[PDB]
Design a protein around this ligand. Structure first.
Ligand SMILES: C[As](C)(=O)[O-]
Ligand SMILES: C[As](C)(=O)[O-]
Ligand code: NA
Ligand SMILES: [Zn+2]
Ligand SMILES: [Zn+2]
Ligand SMILES: [Zn+2]
Ligand SMILES: [Zn+2]
Lengths: 360, 360
């Protein structure tokens, strides 16, 4: 209803009669599941769901408000959509040109009785509805508890991968469908790798270990990073080589978060965090964006980047995750998911972002 | 290398001067890793790898036989490939039209100084090399032990989500990188959902519970289904509501395996399973294919489906997974990964497929 109204408004604004939704992320709200298979066709007057025998009985429960079509040998996308084009005399038909393969679009371009136009409805997902925000909250909540669990769990001698397995297992136990992306556990020198997926490297005492991870909860994602200190005998934060670097990052993260409220454009938030790191003399060791939107996918638009001029509004959720990465020494990243509120910004993680020790 | 020769034989047969490989699965044999980023360019005369700083040092070391190019701001897909097109006067360039989006292929066709032709090298992967067969053989092993473990682990009272967490965790602990796909755990009435991903539903005594799951091991996939009987007081197989249905499924599964040997068309294997299920009076509740090939991906070609006329060859690996799904009652599926052998067929799982009780 609200989902369908929002889509139809988009159709009119875009000069389109209907849209063929094929991407899993844009099909999920309608299907109640995330699948590569199946299609959703939305017209100004009707709503259709197309699935094969593998998903029919499962979708059928949730699919109130939709016309339900079985995909089989005789009944295909072509036969079904063409029937729909006929009944409502549809002239123009949208498709996700960034999600559909050249081959599939090309067959469509020849087989579909309408003018096919590459359009993307991804922009509608920028502002979340309360039901979505709530789902993301529990995703974020599941993540938040995982951080604490994994902090008590970590022992010098363990592998980065074991830590990830344990962390994911715990998230799963907390109701997660799975991790929202391949878990990053980057200890010691691997901390210099912003994308250091958990490896067989042994975690050692006195090392920083960066955990970047997240939960998929009912089709919505969380995304968190904490850089912890692997505890051992005579280990202290202030003695660490990268202690100042840690603080510079934590500060840059706060500087970006305090800069978030409705109305502020995205590039200014990156400017906030980046200038702190840059005037600290580490501008060249901050190679990625300050953050990214999040929702049905881990990475959505807009971006906290130097070039993104998108203006901020309540209902948006974005990550704030600056970092400094020093090849040969290690690195630090600290990430929060931030919900934009009418008043300002709201952090959905309770986990402290100071230097914490593992174990005990 | 045989890999490059086989590709070059394919190039010749396809009448293409070169191919641009972009999909993670078709790059993996060349890169030794699985990434969305990066490209592999093979001509009749040369072999190239294009990766960014994240993978360059590790790939450049291992990737002997290739010309290595760094991807950065200055050196891009366009600048690098166009140089190669120039140096060897390439006329035609194949690209994976089923993996590259409509938008991306359009951009490439204009930015690249050659005629791009949608071609797909996926067929070279149908027959596995002894190295590949072994890796899959071991991937299957991890799943096989996981099934044995999870069967003893399951107790009435657990949720499907909980059972999945343990099964996934155990696979990791057994050396798996991760699950090859989202784990299906469908107990009682949810057993009527062929893709019923593990939910919060409690598994109850006397329920059938279907576990469909798999491991990603060394870049290759396993895929297994077992339907177990949840143990409880006075619970017995023969008394179960779906016992006959279970037996019909098991029978159809064996009949399909028995049909597998070099020379047989894939549709004939499907015919074997479907005829058993159909003659039993349950054809209308067996809506999906009998199986699929598996390798770098969980789903590959050919398919054990009514229409696939592909003839079986030694070194191919396919699943055999017929099922019967009864809305309101439950369902049964039994899945093996089967290696086509020189003489006939070999099942790579040791787990029994008769009705097994959980626990103890
Ligand atoms: C590793 As990320 C950009 O999903 O926080
Ligand atoms: C659930 As399957 C088609 O990957 O066995
Ligand atoms: Na061209
Ligand atoms: Zn993250
Ligand atoms: Zn992030
Ligand atoms: Zn399968
Ligand atoms: Zn399966």
């Amino acid at each position: 209803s609200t989902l369908l109204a929002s889509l139809r408004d988009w159709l009119k604004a875009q000069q389109l009669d209907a849209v063929l939704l094929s991407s899993r992320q844009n099909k999920q709200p309608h299907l109640g599941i995330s699948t590569g298979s199946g299609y959703v066709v939305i017209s100004r007057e009707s709503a259709h769901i197309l699935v094969d025998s593998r998903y029919y009985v499962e979708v059928e429960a949730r699919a109130q408000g939709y016309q339900l079509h079985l995909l089989d040998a005789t009944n295909t996308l072509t036969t079904i959509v063409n029937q729909i084009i006929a009944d409502e005399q549809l002239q123009t038909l949208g498709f996700e040109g960034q999600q559909v393969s050249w081959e599939t679009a090309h067959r469509w371009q020849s087989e579909l009785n309408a003018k096919l136009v590459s359009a993307t409805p991804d922009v509608l997902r920028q502002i979340k509805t309360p039901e979505e925000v709530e789902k993301i909250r529990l995703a974020c909540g599941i993540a938040d508890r995982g951080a604490e669990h994994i902090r008590r769990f970590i022992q010098a001698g363990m592998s980065e991968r074991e830590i990830a397995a344990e962390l994911e297992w715990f998230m799963r136990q907390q109701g997660a469908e799975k991790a929202s992306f391949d878990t990053i556990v980057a200890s010691g020198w691997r901390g210099a790798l912003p994308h250091g997926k958990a490896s067989d490297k042994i975690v050692a005492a006195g090392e920083f270990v960066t955990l970047d991870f997240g939960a998929l909860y009912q089709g919505y994602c969380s995304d968190m990073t904490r850089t912890l200190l692997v505890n051992g005998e005579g280990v202290s934060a202030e003695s660490h080589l990268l202690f100042n670097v840690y603080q510079i990052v934590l500060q840059a993260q706060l500087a970006a978060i305090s800069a978030i409220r409705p109305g502020v454009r995205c590039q200014q938030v990156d400017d906030a965090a980046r200038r702190v790191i840059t005037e600290a003399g580490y501008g060249d060791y901050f190679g990625h964006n300050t953050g990214h939107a999040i929702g049905i996918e881990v990475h959505e638009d807009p971006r906290f980047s130097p070039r993104d001029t998108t203006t901020l509004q309540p209902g948006m959720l974005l990550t704030v995750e600056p970092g400094i990465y020093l090849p040969g020494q290690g690195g630090v990243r600290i990430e929060d998911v931030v919900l934009v509120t009418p008043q300002g910004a709201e952090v959905l993680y309770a986990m402290p972002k100071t230097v914490l020790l593992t174990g005990e």
